[PDB]
């Protein structure tokens, strides 16, 4: 059973801690980050799905950045590798607050996390 | 004034959304309507509001936890005040579906946009 | 029979010009857009899928700025909407060029265009 | 020194790129490799790398016209030179399906990322 509650850590050296995954599926935690001042915390807020009881469901969760006016939305799947080991794979969405609806098409980022337990 | 997220939403692809209250820390739920040919389903959302200097046009980002499948999707946009005064929810999404070897991961995501305006 | 040889227009007020198609599919042009110094120009050259000669075929295609360092690539269909018009619905990935590899995780930024005939 | 996209390349998921020599214009042509479980298979590609300021960790886009399906794949990204020394192609892609109605164009877009290293 792949569980999102615990510590993790990615690719990119940014933390992570979920905390418990309540019957409808809904998890709160923080997202830690460093600046290169130091480290930043960020509350972030999502759900796993459980339809079928999957032991790797797929879920989602927001990370409202609590030092910039944007905001980024990870989706992936819980994994269990050919070690045991359990494997977030994740892709993102960075949305960027522009002043104008003219300058929208340039405000989106993309791409990935790979996170495992710390 | 400013865009608030708060009411009832519908796209351009005829989904209809109802966001509820947005508190102080920013979280909102609601639900997302969907159709399948009629046929509509019903899921739960849950997302948060950048508050960060209480911007008049707030970014924000949420997940829709579908309640007929195994996929899940997240969006994340801008509420804007459109040229013509209309409040505007520009957004993009990721839609995340269930493969069963991490071998399969590579192609079990899509992206699309989605505009929302009020019902 | 959905073509694109042609002029085109989008969303954005951007305007491509693309040559003929030749047997293997490939084809190239112009890709035009405004600044708000004022128009710049920028070549494309790209790929239309010939498999089953669909007459809605997928495509995609490369557009090489000429007034940056970053790429844009291009992938979408050829419709053939209710009104018998032509409409290619696209979505694009557009790399900035970053100095150290390190910075590579924020380069990239997606969006939609749909072009209609000018 | 500079990185170049010239070459015999392999990503992440066991797929194989060979990339000719880059004209003056910047444009270029090749072959993509991928298995299928060994029964591979073979199709062209053709892309530019951005000339703009010479830079040696240039950005670049290419197109795949798979032979054998009616989708297409775009790749960007920048050739790097890794701390190590070694060249890589960071890369993002777009792989785009074919649908009958343009009413199904919502859920044509797949979205991923591939790192190339010199085979
Ligand atoms: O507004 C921001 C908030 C920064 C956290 C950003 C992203 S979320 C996906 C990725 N995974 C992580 O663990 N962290 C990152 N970022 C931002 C925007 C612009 C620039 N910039 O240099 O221009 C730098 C950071
Ligand atoms: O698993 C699913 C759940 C369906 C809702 C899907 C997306 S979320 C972005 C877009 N905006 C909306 O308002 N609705 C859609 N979808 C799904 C997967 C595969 C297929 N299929 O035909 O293969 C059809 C639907
Ligand atoms: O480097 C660039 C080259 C600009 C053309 C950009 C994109 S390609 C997708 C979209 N569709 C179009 O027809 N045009 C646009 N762009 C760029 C980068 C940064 C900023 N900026 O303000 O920071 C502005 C433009
Ligand atoms: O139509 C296709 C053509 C397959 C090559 C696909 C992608 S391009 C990005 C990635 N990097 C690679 O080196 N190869 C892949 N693919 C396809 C579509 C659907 C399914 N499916 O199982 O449903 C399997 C393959
Ligand atoms: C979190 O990851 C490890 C856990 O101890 C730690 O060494 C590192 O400094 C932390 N990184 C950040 C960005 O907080
Ligand atoms: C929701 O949008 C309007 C609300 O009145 C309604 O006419 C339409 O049928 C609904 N669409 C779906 C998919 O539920
Ligand atoms: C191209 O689109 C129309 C075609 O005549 C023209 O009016 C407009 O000024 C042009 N736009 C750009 C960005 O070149
Ligand atoms: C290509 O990569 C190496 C080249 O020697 C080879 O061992 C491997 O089998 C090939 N892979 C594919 C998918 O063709």
Same mark, same amino acid.
């Given at each position: 059973?792949?569980?999102? =509650?615990?510590?993790? &850590? !990615?690719?990119?050296?940014?933390?992570?801690?979920? %905390?418990?995954? #309540?019957?409808?599926?809904?998890? +709160?935690?923080?997202? =830690?980050?460093?600046? &290169? !001042?130091?480290?930043?915390?960020?509350?972030?807020? %999502?759900?796993? #799905?459980?339809?079928?009881?999957? +032991?790797?469901?797929?879920?989602?969760?927001?990370? !409202?950045?609590?030092?910039?006016?944007?905001?980024?939305?990870?989706?992936?799947?819980?994994?269990?590798?050919?070690?045991?080991?359990?494997?977030?794979?994740?892709?993102?969405?960075?949305?960027?607050?522009?002043?104008?609806?003219?300058?929208?098409?340039?405000?989106?980022?993309?791409?990935?996390?790979?996170?495992?337990?710390?």
């Amino acid at each position: 059973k792949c569980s999102l =509650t615990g510590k993790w &850590t !990615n690719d990119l050296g940014s933390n992570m801690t979920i %905390g418990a995954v #309540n019957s409808r599926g809904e998890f +709160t935690g923080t997202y =830690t980050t460093a600046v &290169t !001042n130091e480290i930043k915390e960020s509350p972030l807020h %999502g759900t796993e #799905n459980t339809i079928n009881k999957r +032991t790797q469901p797929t879920f989602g969760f927001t990370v !409202n950045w609590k030092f910039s006016e944007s905001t980024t939305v990870f989706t992936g799947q819980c994994f269990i590798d050919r070690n045991g080991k359990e494997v977030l794979k994740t892709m993102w969405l960075l949305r960027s607050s522009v002043n104008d609806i003219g300058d929208d098409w340039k405000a989106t980022r993309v791409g990935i996390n790979i996170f495992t337990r710390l």
